[PDB]
């Protein structure tokens, strides 16, 4: 969803 995971606006697993 983000880049390397699907974090709620975190983007860093």
Are 2 and 8 within 8 A, CB to CB?
A: no
Are 10 and 1 within 8 A, CB to CB?
A: no
CA distance 3 to 10: 10
Per-residue 3-state assignment (H helix, E strand, C coil) for the chain: CCCCCCCCCCCCC
* Residue written as token pair 């975190």: 10
CA distance 7 to 1: 7
CA torsion, ordered 6, 11, 8, 2, to nearest 10 deg: -50
* Residue written as token pair 């860093």: 12
9 dihedral zone (left: phi>0; alpha: psi -120 to 50; beta) = left
């Amino acid at each position: 969803c983000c880049e390397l995971c699907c974090n709620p606006a975190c983007t860093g697993c």
